[PDB]
């Protein structure tokens, strides 16, 4: 058996329990990573800085 | 060239950040060659020359 | 390790120069599948530079 | 099919303005001259003048002049072949400056 997902869920739950002002910036980073991984390709062209 | 290295590094970083996306490639390669010749000479002298 | 370090300096002059040649050969090999004339001219220029 | 000036590893094709087609799919191509470093199919239509190793132009002189078009393109157009393009400019610049 494997239980990595349960461990990650427990980590996220314990993070939500220990709520601070800086949880929102981490949630924003996570959702941005998910969004970029989900679509990507479409709106990336030129602009090596981007 | 007529600046101290302490501000020269910041000037080079700012120029590379800002003017890069709107300049021809050969200008950038000439800039890189002119900046890196002073270290290419030292590297060639100390690790390649005879 | 000290004996090997002392002995290495005699062949270091060839070892350092070999790296650039290996990198160029690897780049040419990587660029082969698109420009299928490069291995011919590259061989001639390699022999000329040798 | 259009007329082929050379055949083999290096292929040179000249086409008129017509919907050239073969077994498979059909597309319209503008009149001109096309040359590819590989024996792959080549056309003057869009989506064909984007692939690596494919050169095109209105005429023989126009194609030769347009061969240098990526050289005046802003940086961030080549990924693997950027090294040889950079070297071809670096060598010319360093020679023409440092000697002459």
From Swiss-Prot, chain C:
Full protein name: Non-structural protein 4
Cell compartments where the protein resides: Host endoplasmic reticulum membrane
Residues annotated as signal peptide: none
Task of the protein: Plays a role in the formation and maintenance of double membrane vesicles (DMVs) replication organelles. DMVs are formed by nsp3 and nsp4, while nsp6 zippers ER membranes and connects to lipid droplets.
Subunit structure: Interacts with PL-PRO and nsp6.
Topology versus the membrane: Multi-pass membrane protein
Membrane-crossing segments per the record: 37-50
Residues of the full protein shown: 3064 to 3113 of 7096
Cytoplasmic side stretches: 3-36
Top-level taxon in the UniProt lineage: Viruses
Effect of residue 27 to I: In strain: Omicron/BA.2, Omicron/BA.2.12.1, Omicron/BA.2.75, Omicron/BA.4, Omicron/BA.5, Omicron/BQ.1.1, Omicron/XBB.1.5, Omicron/EG.5.1
